[PDB]
């Protein structure tokens, strides 16, 4: 279907294309450096669609080194 | 012997039309390589554009090879 | 939608990219941030934060006496509509990323 | 195709036909900038102003007479007052120089833009000091990265993605003085 | 009769336009192909405009074997 | 008449002047499906600048078969 | 008379400059669609340039019809 | 007279490098387009170069003119 | 006089070489515009690479033209 | 003299090498006279066969 | 003296084959000197044009 | 010796053919092993039309 570069063709947005690249970037660090970027690289939130006012279900997110690279 | 003389060395200066027939038909074939390269999604579409493409660049070179059949054959 | 347990250990830029990318799972021409900018420890002026969605009406607001945006020689890979895509996704996941600092601390 | 005139202060006048009064006019992050982009002037000769951002850490805002940067069609040389660019970068060396002292980052990939008023602005996310990079883990991990050849799109862009900047990361760690 | 030898020996040269306008026939179907890559949604509003250019060059095509008629048959 | 031979076989080889002249038809053409591709809102305008070009480059062929028409009838 | 046959071949010899430079025509006026595309807010002061260009270029296409004047009438 | 018929058939297959000058001089008059529609600011200075371009290689066009001219009167 | 009638055949045919170099300064003389439209602040050393290139790319047209007073005048 | 045509395509080789200097020298300008040193061994190793033209111009001629 | 307008093409192909190497070299510094081995694998295999031509030149000329 | 004026441009052939892989290798390295590849495959197949004009160039020679 769609019309774009490498990673918009295969359902990938900007920010999940350039996290990755900041996620694989941050792993080739020295231990004194890559423990420090590896606190900028833990995802913690929770998601809920809500769909009438008042429930829906929820997504929690607990990544810790980064994005996630699967398909969402 | 000038008449069956001349009409092939006008015959052989008549098909180097064959020669930017082949280049623009070069170049027509390396952009719908770099067209598929471009947007891979719609490749086979443009594949529709260089065979139509091609066909009408032919429009030049079956026009050419008529003006060499007629001086070998009016 | 509800986000929450946002700031439970900090916030980065990374979770906010995911924020941003449900954003665009729907397809608006606009997006609007209401954040509380830390101006001081005093402070904290409510703050409006606003991003056109790239070739269905970024593109439009532009068009002003020609364009605005034509000034600009693309070094992209692909044409400017997609590189105003990947530029509002990235324009969209700084500015909830510093929204969602700014409001921390304020 | 202008048909209607918004901005900061056209939000405060609509904004007072239809809220409540006892709210202020809320402000707008145009009003925490200073540079502009249409405005005449601030190249001065030779050093233009040069703005290198992450999203956690600013890492210059100085002025430079050049900067080099890792264009999606290759390494460019921005100099003063050089034509408006906004420029993909892939995984390359950002190169600032002010004179013969040279601070050279590898970045993960992120734009820059060169404005109609000559200020560069390079937006990337992660900013590796090549002093900083483990060049023991470059190689490893390209390995696996060349060898895993999945059936999905998403990965395949994952992967495509995973060599070039590790690729970029060799080629910026060997020659460097 | 080197008048007729003239005549074959000049409309062979006078096809070598041929070459030329093949050139940049395949050329214009060369950005065809590009040009659909960049907007595939104005992509058969550039057939329109493919065709368009293609008669308008295959126009000289059929101004250079009138004059090919007009050294053979005239 | 080695005379009325040579208003053939200049004629003939006065006519390669539509090689070059479609060669470059093809490009300026070739350049309005890309201005197209690029800005498809303005595309047409942009028709108003391929067939500008067009009568001015239609200005060296109206240049040749002048030429053409100053030795075979002239 | 073979002094003035040899005026037609090399008047048909001086023609195929009139190619060239329609292919420089070509080229430009090409550049035309594309810049003007790029940037609409100069789409006529780049014909303030392309004219310009298609001026001082027929500045070479005048010389080559003026060596079609020097062959062919002298 | 067979040196006469000599000088015309020379200078008129000398003066096709006029066709390489006009499809280089468009080139240049092409960047000239393409180049002021990137910024206009110097727009100004850049016809600056095309004109400084365009006697440079007109320069090239009378060379060749030259030995058109030392043909047919030398 | 068949001997001097080839040196002037021969020296039209060897001044063609000249349509090269008038293709390839004009190539050069479009990149500096094209070159100095992206950072015009080097563009003075970029005339002092255009005015090395036209020197030597100028210096096989004189090449090119000794070969031509070699043929004439030798 | 047509063995000297062969200074044609030379000719414009010549200028899409030097072309492509002021291309790569306004892309990429702090090693702009590092690419000087690439286009002049671009330019001895064109006018190398513009010398194999003249080999055979100055065969014919003379020999 | 018609059969060496070969070398014209092969010249030609040069210039865009050694322009590209100043270019690739403006576009990737780091690997500089690695396209000149690049460029000079295109130069080694090239001129086998400009020596399957001057064969023939050699071939018309004594033989 | 008029027939070798098609080795003309397929000398412009490999060599717009040659300068496409200091651009495409620059552009990327990390498929620099893997182009040389396509142009070697380019390679004998755009010779295949110098070993079709040297068809001719060693038949009316030498029949």
Not at chain 1, 7 to 28: E, F, K, P, W
């Amino acid at each position: 279907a769609p019309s774009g570069p490498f990673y918009r063709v295969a359902g990938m947005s900007y920010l999940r294309y350039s996290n990755i690249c900041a996620d694989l970037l941050r792993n080739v660090l020295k231990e004194p450096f890559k423990a420090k970027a590896q606190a900028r690289q833990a995802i913690h939130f929770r998601q809920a669609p809500y769909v009438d006012g008042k429930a829906g279900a929820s997504k929690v997110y607990e990544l810790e080194n980064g994005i996630p690279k699967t398909a969402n | 012997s000038v008449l069956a003389a001349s009409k092939m060395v006008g015959a052989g200066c008549a098909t180097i039309a064959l020669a930017g027939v082949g280049a623009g038909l070069g170049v027509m074939f390396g952009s719908l390589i770099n067209g598929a390269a471009r947007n891979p999604n719609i490749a086979k579409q443009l594949v529709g554009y260089a065979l139509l493409g091609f066909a009408l660049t032919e429009s030049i070179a079956l026009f050419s090879l008529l003006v060499v059949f007629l001086i070998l054959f009016a | 939608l509800a986000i929450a347990d946002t700031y439970k250990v900090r916030v980065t830029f990374g979770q906010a990219s995911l924020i941003v990318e449900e954003l665009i799972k729907h397809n608006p021409q606009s997006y609007q941030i209401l954040f509380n900018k830390f101006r001081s420890a005093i402070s904290f002026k409510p703050t409006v934060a606003t991003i056109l969605s790239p070739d269905l009406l970024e593109k439009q607001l532009e068009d002003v006496t020609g364009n605005s945006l034509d000034a600009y020689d693309i070094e992209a890979s692909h044409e400017r509509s997609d590189v105003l895509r990947d530029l509002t996704e990235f324009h969209l996941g700084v500015t909830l990323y510093n929204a969602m600092l700014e409001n921390n601390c304020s | 195709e202008a048909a209607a005139p918004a901005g900061p202060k056209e939000f405060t006048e609509v904004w007072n036909k239809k809220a409540p009064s006892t709210l202020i006019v809320p402000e707008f992050p145009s009003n925490y900038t200073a540079v502009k982009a249409v405005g005449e002037g601030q190249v001065h000769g030779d050093a233009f102003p040069v703005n290198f951002y992450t999203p956690h850490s600013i890492l210059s805002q100085a002025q430079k007479d050049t900067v080099v940067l890792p264009g999606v069609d290759g390494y460019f040389g921005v100099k003063a007052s050089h034509v408006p660019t906004i420029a993909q970068l892939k995984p390359g060396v950002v190169e600032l120089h002010s004179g013969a002292e040279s601070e050279k980052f590898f970045v993960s990939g992120g734009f820059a833009f060169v404005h109609p008023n000559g200020v560069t602005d390079i937006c990337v996310l992660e900013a590796a000091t090549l002093d900083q990079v483990d060049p023991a883990a470059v190689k490893s991990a390209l390995a696996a990265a060349s060898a895993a050849q999945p059936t999905d799109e998403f990965e395949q862009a994952a992967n495509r993605a995973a060599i070039e900047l590790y690729s970029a990361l060799e080629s910026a760690v060997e020659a460097k003085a």
